[PDB]
């Protein structure tokens, strides 16, 4: 089961 | 066993997993999540928020320290 991407515009 | 969400997470629109909505917890930044045990091989905590339990990705949350 795969980890989500941290939104780049929030990071 | 408390973790703080560093980002918003809406599994319905953001999960890379096909069962994400049904199995993963939704949260917004600053939510405090109750974690039981340790993070699994996939990198997910088993957690509780607002009367619901589900998988929580470790990279979206920070342990209270």
Coordinates of C-alpha atoms in Angstrom, one line a residue:
Chain A
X1 CA 0.0 0.0 0.0
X2 CA 1.4 3.3 -1.3
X3 CA 2.2 6.6 0.6
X4 CA 0.5 9.8 -0.7
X5 CA 2.4 12.7 -2.2
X6 CA 2.8 15.8 0.1
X7 CA 1.2 18.6 -1.9
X8 CA 4.0 20.7 -3.3
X9 CA 2.0 24.0 -3.1
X10 CA 1.5 23.3 0.6
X11 CA 5.1 22.2 1.4
Chain B
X1 CA 0.4 7.9 21.1
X2 CA -0.5 11.4 19.6
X3 CA 0.4 12.7 16.2
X4 CA -0.3 16.1 14.6
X5 CA -1.2 16.4 10.9
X6 CA 1.2 18.7 9.1
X7 CA -0.9 18.8 5.9
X8 CA -4.6 18.3 4.9
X9 CA -5.3 14.8 3.6
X10 CA -8.4 13.9 1.7
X11 CA -8.0 10.2 0.6
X12 CA -11.0 10.4 -1.8
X13 CA -9.0 12.9 -4.0
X14 CA -5.4 12.4 -2.8
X15 CA -4.9 8.7 -2.0
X16 CA -2.8 6.7 -4.6
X17 CA -4.6 3.5 -3.3
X18 CA -7.8 2.2 -4.9
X19 CA -9.3 1.4 -1.4
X20 CA -8.0 4.7 0.0
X21 CA -11.3 6.4 0.8
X22 CA -12.6 3.3 2.7
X23 CA -9.4 2.5 4.6
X24 CA -7.5 5.7 5.2
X25 CA -8.3 8.5 7.6
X26 CA -9.2 11.9 6.3
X27 CA -7.7 14.8 8.3
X28 CA -6.9 18.5 8.0
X29 CA -3.7 20.2 9.1
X30 CA -3.4 20.6 12.9
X31 CA -5.7 17.6 13.7
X32 CA -4.5 15.5 16.5
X33 CA -4.6 11.7 15.8
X34 CA -4.5 8.8 18.2
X35 CA -2.1 6.1 17.1
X36 CA -2.0 2.5 18.3
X37 CA 1.2 0.4 18.0
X38 CA 3.9 1.3 15.4
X39 CA 4.1 2.1 11.7
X40 CA 3.8 -0.8 9.4
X41 CA 6.1 -1.9 6.5
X42 CA 4.1 0.3 4.1
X43 CA 4.8 3.4 6.3
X44 CA 1.3 3.7 7.7
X45 CA 0.1 4.1 11.3
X46 CA -3.2 2.7 12.5
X47 CA -5.0 5.7 14.0
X48 CA -8.2 7.2 15.4
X49 CA -9.9 10.5 14.7
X50 CA -13.4 11.7 15.3
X51 CA -14.9 8.3 16.2
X52 CA -13.3 6.6 13.2
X53 CA -10.2 4.4 12.8
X54 CA -8.0 4.0 9.7
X55 CA -4.6 4.0 8.1
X56 CA -2.5 7.2 8.5
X57 CA 0.5 7.9 6.3
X58 CA 3.6 8.7 8.4
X59 CA 4.9 11.4 6.0
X60 CA 1.8 13.5 6.6
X61 CA 2.0 13.5 10.4
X62 CA 4.5 14.4 13.2
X63 CA 4.8 12.6 16.6
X64 CA 4.2 14.8 19.7
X65 CA 7.5 15.1 21.3

